[PDB]
Amino acid sequence: ETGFSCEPITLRMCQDLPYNTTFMPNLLNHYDQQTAALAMEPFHPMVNLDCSRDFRPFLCALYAPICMEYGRVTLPCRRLCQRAYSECSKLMEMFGVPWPEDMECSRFPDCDEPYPGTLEVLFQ
Amino acid sequence: GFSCEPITLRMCQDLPYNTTFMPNLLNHYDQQTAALAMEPFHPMVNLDCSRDFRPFLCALYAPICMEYGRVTLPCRRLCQRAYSECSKLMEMFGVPWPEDMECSRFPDCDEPYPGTLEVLFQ
Amino acid sequence: GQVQLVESGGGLVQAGGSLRLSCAASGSISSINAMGWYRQAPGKQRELVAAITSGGSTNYADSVKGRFTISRDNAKNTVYLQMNSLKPGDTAVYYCNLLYYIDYVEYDYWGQGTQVTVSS
Amino acid sequence: GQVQLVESGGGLVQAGGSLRLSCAASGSISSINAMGWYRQAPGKQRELVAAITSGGSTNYADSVKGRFTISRDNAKNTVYLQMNSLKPGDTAVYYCNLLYYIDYVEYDYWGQGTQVTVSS
Ligand SMILES: *[C@@H]1O[C@H](CO)[C@@H](O)[C@H](O)[C@H]1NC(C)=O
Ligand SMILES: *[C@@H]1O[C@H](CO)[C@@H](O)[C@H](O)[C@H]1NC(C)=O
């Protein structure tokens, strides 16, 4: 095989999403997801207190993105980032959680590119 | 096409290569998780039971930096020799062999280039 | 069922002394919440001191690390600030807050303030 | 000179008592090494008790955790086994071991063994 698969998501804050796997190297999977879970843990107060409906979808898009054919990268839309940031920034400031440089919302797409660049995914 | 950072893992210095690919979101967190996974093996590395052990461990936790951050793996034969040559010392120190190090899971290193290749350093 | 936070435990101590602030929230509140301690010196901006989620996760301002401890009694909906090794620079009015969300609508309640004064 | 292991400290104690084994390595050995204690009761298989590297990493058999302590003096190449809360089931010949590698060649030396006997 290729050495990669869609692996079950084991990040504790990325359960009960519309999808349940993410693209990972087979041998490095548990290690990679353990590292992602560690990186995501500082955001737990925001996820638990639910300051934004957009926050968990945004973070899980970055740490456990939907599994695509050939492992293609997917990204959340800039507007999602911006609303998650705005709605959760008071609580992030209260708990000393900085917004990482690699999450600066200007880095994310406007979601106005022709299909398949921007698309809608349906879930039953 | 490269985003290589210096290897900071203490058990992965003085290798033929000195950088590794680190995704931005995972930097620091990765080395914390790697140090935790490698710590049970510190006696194996320090006492030098196998020439193959440190290359194998650092292949998993500080792999060579590739264009586009491509994944590389050590060959099954490397895993097998590192395991057999260090098994006496690991048993003496109660060091378990993790699931993600089971040697049968690693490549036979017989796929056509670039799937298997030789890297030169001289 | 109306929500109010009431503060106590401030006063005057000499430098090196200790104080314990208490902030008791009464009324109908969400059991998943954050509670914080803030301070404001005369004429200056209000500043975060420490915060704690209902789960027990804490955050501390650098200026108070190792000296102040925040804690809570969820049974009592009360948050505490144990203030050891007090310095003159800790003099301020101390405020507690209670922060939670209901269907993403923010609720942010504040205590009435308690004066802390640390003499030379 | 050639490597030699000298053991001492065995003997007879009542259950609940204590003993200290020592094992002194002489000769040309690597300063980076592991030293261990093993035990074998007559008619039974040899079993690991405890081990320690020159760096200080330790490992204990579950049956002796909290009762036995291994330690070493790198200066004199000596390993010790402090055996507290002894039980009749600890009765056995205890062997010291010295394990190291030079250019990936294994050197593995064994002491002569010393008897530990624990009466009811
Ligand atoms: C993940 O979702 C797929 C499709 O919805 C389902 O077939 C699979 O069983 C799920 N995995 C679980 C529930 O572990
Ligand atoms: C890493 O190795 C490369 C190639 O030998 C060398 O050019 C570079 O200076 C090295 N970097 C460090 C920090 O040693």
Side-chain angles (χ1 to χ4, degrees), chain A residues 61-76:
Chain A
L62 300 180
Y63 294 111
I66 193 169
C67 193
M68 300 285 277
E69 193 198 26
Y70 302 130
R72 288 194 184 98
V73 172
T74 57
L75 293 177

Side-chain angles (χ1 to χ4, degrees), chain A residues 8-9 17-21 123:
Chain A
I9 296 169
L17 299 172
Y19 60 99
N20 59 13
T21 60
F123 299 85

Side-chain angles (χ1 to χ4, degrees), chain B residues 23-91:
Chain B
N24 284 338
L25 280 167
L26 306 174
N27 186 42
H28 299 306
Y29 304 107
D30 181 285
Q31 293 94 321
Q32 289 179 252
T33 60
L36 200 53
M38 303 171 84
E39 195 59 22
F41 300 108
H42 194 276
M44 288 71 258
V45 169
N46 183 27
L47 274 67
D48 260 302
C49 39
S50 177
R51 211 200 302 278
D52 291 348
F53 199 86
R54 202 165 78 93
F56 173 70
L57 215 59
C58 294
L60 301 178
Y61 296 109
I64 192 168
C65 190
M66 300 284 278
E67 194 198 27
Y68 300 127
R70 287 197 183 99
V71 174
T72 58
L73 291 176
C75 302
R76 180 180 311 154
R77 280 245 284 158
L78 186 78
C79 181
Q80 291 176 319
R81 182 156 279 170
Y83 178 81
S84 62
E85 293 182 332
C86 283
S87 61
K88 181 181 290 192
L89 189 62
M90 290 189 288
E91 188 172 351

Side-chain angles (χ1 to χ4, degrees), chain A residues 3-4 7 25-32 34-40 42 62-63 100-103 107, chain B residues 23-26 28-35 37 59-61 71-73 99-102 105-107:
Chain A
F4 299 91
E7 296 280 12
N26 293 339
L27 273 169
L28 304 168
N29 177 41
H30 291 307
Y31 174 63
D32 288 357
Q34 287 177 55
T35 295
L38 195 55
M40 194 176 167
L62 300 180
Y63 294 111
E101 205 294 306
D102 49 20
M103 290 182 189
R107 299 175 9 109
Chain B
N24 284 338
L25 280 167
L26 306 174
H28 299 306
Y29 304 107
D30 181 285
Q31 293 94 321
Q32 289 179 252
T33 60
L60 301 178
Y61 296 109
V71 174
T72 58
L73 291 176
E99 194 41 52
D100 51 21
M101 291 175 68
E102 181 189 11
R105 300 176 67 195
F106 285 80

Side-chain angles (χ1 to χ4, degrees), chain A residues 47-68:
Chain A
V47 170
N48 184 28
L49 275 67
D50 262 302
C51 38
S52 177
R53 205 192 292 275
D54 292 348
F55 199 80
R56 203 167 78 93
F58 173 72
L59 293 187
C60 292
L62 300 180
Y63 294 111
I66 193 169
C67 193
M68 300 285 277

